[PDB]
Amino acid sequence: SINGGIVVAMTGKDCVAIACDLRFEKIFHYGHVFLGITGLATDVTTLNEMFRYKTNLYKLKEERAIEPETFTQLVSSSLYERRFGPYFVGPVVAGINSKSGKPFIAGFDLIGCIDEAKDFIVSGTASDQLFGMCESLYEPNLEPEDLFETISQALLNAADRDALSGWGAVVYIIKKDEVVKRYLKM
Amino acid sequence: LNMSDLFELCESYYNKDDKASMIMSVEIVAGLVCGSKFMSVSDLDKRDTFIENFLAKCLDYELNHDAFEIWSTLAWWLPAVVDLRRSKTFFCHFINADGMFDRESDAATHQTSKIYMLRSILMSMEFRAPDVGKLFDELVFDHPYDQVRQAVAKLLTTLVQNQSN
Amino acid sequence: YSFSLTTFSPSGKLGQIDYALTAVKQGVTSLGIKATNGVVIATEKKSSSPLAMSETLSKVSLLTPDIGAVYSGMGPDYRVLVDKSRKVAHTSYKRIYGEYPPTKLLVSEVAKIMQEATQSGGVRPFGVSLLIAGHDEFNGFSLYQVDPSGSYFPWKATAIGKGSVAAKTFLEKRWNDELELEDAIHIALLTLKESVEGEFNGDTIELAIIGDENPDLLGYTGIPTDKGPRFRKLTSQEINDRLEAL
Amino acid sequence: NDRHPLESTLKNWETTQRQRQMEQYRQIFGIAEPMKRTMEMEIVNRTDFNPLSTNGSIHRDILLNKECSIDWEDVYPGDVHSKIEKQLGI
Amino acid sequence: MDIILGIRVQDSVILASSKADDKTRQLSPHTLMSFAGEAGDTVQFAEYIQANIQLYSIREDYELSPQAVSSFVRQELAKSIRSRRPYQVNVLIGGYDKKKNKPELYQIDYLGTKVELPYGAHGYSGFYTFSLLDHHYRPDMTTEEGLDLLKLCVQELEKRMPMDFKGVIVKIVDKDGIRQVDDF
Amino acid sequence: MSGYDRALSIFSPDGHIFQVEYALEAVKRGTCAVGVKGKNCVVLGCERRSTLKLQDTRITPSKVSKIDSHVVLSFSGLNADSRILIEKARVEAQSHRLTLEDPVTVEYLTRYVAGVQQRYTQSGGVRPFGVSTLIAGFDPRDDEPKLYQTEPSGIYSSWSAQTIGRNSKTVREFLEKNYDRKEPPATVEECVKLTVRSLLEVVQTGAKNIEITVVKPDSDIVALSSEEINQYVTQIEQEKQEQQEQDKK
Amino acid sequence: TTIFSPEGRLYQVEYALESISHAGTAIGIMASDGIVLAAERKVTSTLLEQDTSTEKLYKLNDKIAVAVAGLTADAEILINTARIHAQNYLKTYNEDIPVEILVRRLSDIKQGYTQHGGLRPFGVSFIYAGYDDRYGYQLYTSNPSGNYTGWKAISVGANTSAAQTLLQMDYKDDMKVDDAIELALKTLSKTTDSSALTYDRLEFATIRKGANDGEVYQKIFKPQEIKDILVKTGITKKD
């Protein structure tokens, strides 16, 4: 129900990550592609319904699941359709090409301009505290366990250190043939 | 097998609730009456007393619509292929079937089935029917039910036709 | 209001579509072959006069940069389907997914257009059978046939038109599951050499391939991400050079 | 009103552009030309009913000169008895 | 006034709605909605929802889960705002899931924001109900403890707002379907 | 308009031998459907054709269809059509309340149904429905049982008992002898017993083929199960044995 | 032209029913713990692409499948409409579509194409399959008329009558999915016009539960998996 909240996304050697605020995850999945949406909670849920629909129909019509880059073009072209009255959101797609193995992260404004940073992505209000933390803690080509470590400490440090009893974070760590969802509490 | 092994097969297939099981019972009855040209005098008697009790159990109470279709099919088809005098109790069950002309009987559909089964037997024999002169004194032409009054009119038709040659 | 066409004949047949398959059966033959690393589609060009310039009558057509088409039947029916097929690829799929549709999704959409013409008052079914051939990252190379009914079929090889039964018998006799694109081109040139009504050379024959990407034909450099057209239409000199290797 | 400036214009754009074209053809070519063009469109629209397909028609795109052009309206589009009793009158 | 309160218990959902029409609609044998807001739009929206779930229940000879009625209510609430300036509406749906034997409670905002709850309120309340509920609330609370928590909650609301709200109607969904319970 | 009346031989106008007559032929070939009123109930009953051995009974539709909490519809003729005809009536009734703060009246559920059937007769090379229906129930705030029949032409009529479909002559003949309009069945049990006797004369085999729905005032709609109609069938068959053995000779 | 025969019967529906009576055989069987679908495919073409992903059998959503007898061009229009309705129900109610609601949905569209004279009817018969919590494993059939019926085992298309007789004598209410695998393969081998059954002539699928309590899984079998149930069953066209 809480409006806003933050999502963070990050690349490692053959792996991806998606951190998010709990206390209803912002982070959905459609097969191997993950979508963290920040913003108005009604638009986060309406977009979940809309992309679930579109991606189930895709899987039915095309005999295979929607790849991270294709899903990026679908989310941007769907968001653009809403041009005069958009979805009040910051979507963050992620996922590992099932035919290549390359990490992918992208994020968008409310009408679908594609960012495609090769390192990390942020979305939500007060992003630029986390943008500094994430630029400070990131390094290229991590293993999955260090990749979990850098994204989780970014979330903890940029966290409101005054209300850490109200805390809770979900970190999806996504690999080629495996996905682990760690819930994380203090 | 005995004859009675075929009287227990006929009994086992007679099942009011399944039309096809019920047909196989009436096909064994038809076979028992048709097979009469090959039967010995004691097997004849066994067949006649089995047929008497079997027909009485099937037809004297609680006839359903699918049973009436199968028995009306036998009543048309059987006299056209075997002489009903080969078996004392077959033509006798239909000609002497009780309450077949009782005006007070509210069982009018049952009574109509008896009249139409007898009519089918008399239509299938025609000028070879036995002395049915007792029927002319028994006919109602005054039944309260419309169904039993129209089986009587169609029966007088076949009785007049049987005399008319 | 007693209004429909292509109603059922008492033997369980659609009738008008049957007459539409007799128009297809009268056209100049076209054929298609799928190989291990590419595909081929081919046909003959029949001149109404030798004064006609058959550089203008293309029969083999680009639907998307990885998908080709060819027909047998009524060419006018085929010029109108090809331009709807092109519009469909862009409007239904490229403008939603930023990538072109597969050769099973575009064949379904072409077939949906031909089905709607059978189930209508006011319109006759199409007088064309279409061979659609192409490539996609997850399905790989594919060839399909579409008939006036709106029925579509995946084929390893096929032929349609006058010479089609003798072509399909040659295609069964010659096809094997390890063909390559230079092999399939030779088999297709051999098959049209039997079906040809007129003269056989690089000017009378249409031939296209969906093969490797050709980065020359993209017409701009700087973006390796964009591999460049798989669909290539053989030049009349290449056809004459391969017809010298025959 | 609170309603977007462009909304009523883009709602009626397809109708307005053809209605404006027919008036130019009346003016430059005379009443016969829009009388011909409206009757062709009437035959195409009225003889082409199929309750499960709403995606336009192939001959209407030839008639309207839309056979190689995409609008946002063609990439972003938007009961068989209810269709039947509208096509025939209730 | 137009207050709504909610205290779901181990084996029931308790919907309390302000006394005035109830502004709470029986959607089925085991589902209530309560609603609050701009009196024209909400009453008409609730009857549209009720007619669609009654039509489903007749057309199927079946019940609709408290989830499915709730997501239908959010989808129709959101779909009603796609040509309109948002009307003030809040929906509090409580029902009994007879295929899993759980009572369930949902809140929907004017923007169409589903939240699945232990307890909820709208219309005429601040942190006084929410603090009083969070201190006393338990996952296994009984219906009699729930009615006492609701009495504490209505007393806290009465003490802070001594004007006459004419008490509230309380209604319960459980194994036995809708029970209207007398409370004061 | 039919048979031997023919002036100077004859020739046909626009007239009788027509699509609606062939829809009436489709209705007569569909299973027997019956309804009888009582003092304070109405019972609708139907013939199932005897189910095939591989058919699935728990999901098989109840033939008598509830249109609303107080209205019930049964039919003979084409099933597919009756499914399309019940959908229109159900949404028409739910829409009635949503726009009139009033549940649909039984007479408005009969004028609407026959009314929509009449529009598919009138014109257009859209065919009429091969369906005839019984519509039964109660109005709200009343205790009078109602029972209507509708026909493919869009004609409708009120009956205190009626039958449609296969063999319905013989059933209507039995009802005219057993239903007294001065003293109708005074209790639900007798009303159900009368419908089971009425159907027992025309159904294929027995208790399998009958199925009944009882409507009562204040939305008390109640399908009877196989086991409940088996105890009615058995009681009626007991009374047949009792009547036969109470022969005096 | 959608006018009645003088018996009150529809000529076009009867002719569409003649068309599907040629259109290849399909069997469905409802075990105590899953549904089996199987269909026989007349591969008279060597160059037709077997190991194409579908022809007779299709997914409608994550727990519903169909078999088709009839025109595949007609079937694919209905199949897409059913897929759109399944996802539009899931979008509305957040819950997976009940099988009865979808099977009868396609039975209401197919009746409309039989009433209006501008439309020919659809030449298709569907043997639906699926799971939901309202009932459990359900097996339904629907035909060009818009009639639909619930079954424990059923055949459609060619050789229906021989297949129904073979089902009726071997079907048991308490059988397991592996017994329904065996039965559907036996039935088709005891019904086929082709000399013996083989993996490319056969389309197969199942609707089991698996090991994990929340699962229902719809394996539409690839050719190699069908070869394994063929060699296990004793149909076994094996080296």
From Swiss-Prot, chain A:
One Pfam family hit: Proteasome
Keyword annotations: Cytoplasm, Isopeptide bond, Nucleus, Phosphoprotein, Proteasome, Ubl conjugation
Location (main, coarse): cytoplasm
KW ATP-binding (keyword) present: no
Entry superkingdom: Eukaryota
Glycyl lysine isopeptide (Lys-Gly) (interchain with G-Cter in ubiquitin) crosslink location in chain: K54
Subcellular location: Cytoplasm; Nucleus
InterPro entries assigned: Ntn_hydrolases_N (IPR029055), Proteasome_beta_3 (IPR033811), Proteasome_bsu_CS (IPR016050), Proteasome_sua/b (IPR001353), Proteasome_suB-type (IPR023333)
One cellular-component annotation, GO: proteasome complex
GO function terms (MF aspect): endopeptidase activator activity
PROSITE patterns per record: PROTEASOME_BETA_1, PROTEASOME_BETA_2
Keyword match Transmembrane: no
GO biological process: proteasomal ubiquitin-independent protein catabolic process; proteasome-mediated ubiquitin-dependent protein catabolic process
Functional description taken from the UniProt entry: Non-catalytic component of the proteasome which degrades poly-ubiquitinated proteins in the cytoplasm and in the nucleus. It is essential for the regulated turnover of proteins and for the removal of misfolded proteins. The proteasome is a multicatalytic proteinase complex that is characterized by its ability to cleave peptides with Arg, Phe, Tyr, Leu, and Glu adjacent to the leaving group at neutral or slightly basic pH. It has an ATP-dependent proteolytic activity. This subunit may participate in the trypsin-like activity of the enzyme complex.
PANTHER family cross-referenced by the UniProt entry: METALLOPROTEASE TLDD (PTHR32194), PROTEASOME SUBUNIT BETA TYPE-3 (PTHR32194:SF10)
Family to which this protein belongs: Belongs to the peptidase T1B family.
Protein name: Proteasome subunit beta type-3
UniProtKB/Swiss-Prot annotation, chain C:
Main location: cytoplasm
Additional facts recorded: Present with 7060 molecules/cell in log phase SD medium.
S-S bonds: none
UniProt keyword list: Cytoplasm, Isopeptide bond, Nucleus, Proteasome, Ubl conjugation
Compartments in which it is found: Cytoplasm; Nucleus
GO cellular component: nucleus; proteasome complex; proteasome core complex, alpha-subunit complex; proteasome storage granule
Function description: The proteasome degrades poly-ubiquitinated proteins in the cytoplasm and in the nucleus. It is essential for the regulated turnover of proteins and for the removal of misfolded proteins. The proteasome is a multicatalytic proteinase complex that is characterized by its ability to cleave peptides with Arg, Phe, Tyr, Leu, and Glu adjacent to the leaving group at neutral or slightly basic pH. It has an ATP-dependent proteolytic activity.
Name of the protein: Proteasome subunit alpha type-2
Subunit and partners: The 26S proteasome consists of a 20S proteasome core and two 19S regulatory subunits. The 20S proteasome core is composed of 28 subunits that are arranged in four stacked rings, resulting in a barrel-shaped structure. The two end rings are each formed by seven alpha subunits, and the two central rings are each formed by seven beta subunits. The catalytic chamber with the active sites is on the inside of the barrel.
Name of one Pfam family that matches: Proteasome
Glycyl lysine isopeptide (Lys-Gly) (interchain with G-Cter in ubiquitin) cross-link, chain position(s): K104
Family: Belongs to the peptidase T1A family.
Coiled coil spans: none
UniProt keyword annotation of Nucleus present: yes
Domain of life: Eukaryota
Curated annotation (Swiss-Prot), chain E:
GO MF term (any one): endopeptidase activator activity
CC per GO annotation: cytosol; endoplasmic reticulum membrane; nucleus; proteasome complex; proteasome core complex, beta-subunit complex
Compartment(s) of residence: Cytoplasm; Nucleus
Residues modified as Phosphoserine: S65
InterPro entries the UniProt entry points to: Ntn_hydrolases_N, Proteasome_beta2, Proteasome_bsu_CS, Proteasome_sua/b, Proteasome_suB-type
Keywords: Acetylation, Cytoplasm, Nucleus, Phosphoprotein, Proteasome
Modified residues (N-acetylmethionine): M1
Listed Gene3D superfamilies: Glutamine Phosphoribosylpyrophosphate, subunit 1, domain 1 (3.60.20.10)
Entry's Gene Ontology BP terms: proteasomal ubiquitin-independent protein catabolic process; proteasome-mediated ubiquitin-dependent protein catabolic process
Pfam families: Proteasome
Miscellaneous notes: Present with 21800 molecules/cell in log phase SD medium.
Role description: Non-catalytic component of the proteasome which degrades poly-ubiquitinated proteins in the cytoplasm and in the nucleus. It is essential for the regulated turnover of proteins and for the removal of misfolded proteins. The proteasome is a multicatalytic proteinase complex that is characterized by its ability to cleave peptides with Arg, Phe, Tyr, Leu, and Glu adjacent to the leaving group at neutral or slightly basic pH. It has an ATP-dependent proteolytic activity. This subunit has a chymotrypsin-like activity.
Sequence similarity: Belongs to the peptidase T1B family.
Protein name, entry field: Proteasome subunit beta type-4
Lineage: Eukaryota, Fungi, Dikarya, Ascomycota, Saccharomycotina
Curated annotation (Swiss-Prot), chain F:
Segments of skewed composition (Basic and acidic residues): 237-248
Sites of Phosphothreonine modification: T60
InterPro entries: Ntn_hydrolases_N, Proteasome_alpha, Proteasome_alpha-type, Proteasome_asu_N, Proteasome_bsu_CS, Proteasome_sua/b
GO biological process terms, semicolon-separated: proteasomal ubiquitin-independent protein catabolic process; proteasome-mediated ubiquitin-dependent protein catabolic process
Keywords: Cytoplasm, Nucleus, Phosphoprotein, Proteasome
Gene3D superfamilies recorded: Glutamine Phosphoribosylpyrophosphate, subunit 1, domain 1
Main location: cytoplasm
Example of a GO cellular component annotation carried by this entry: proteasome storage granule
Region (Disordered): 235-249
Its biological purpose: The proteasome degrades poly-ubiquitinated proteins in the cytoplasm and in the nucleus. It is essential for the regulated turnover of proteins and for the removal of misfolded proteins. The proteasome is a multicatalytic proteinase complex that is characterized by its ability to cleave peptides with Arg, Phe, Tyr, Leu, and Glu adjacent to the leaving group at neutral or slightly basic pH. It has an ATP-dependent proteolytic activity.
Note: Present with 16800 molecules/cell in log phase SD medium.
Protein name, per record: Proteasome subunit alpha type-4
Upper lineage: Eukaryota, Fungi, Dikarya, Ascomycota, Saccharomycotina
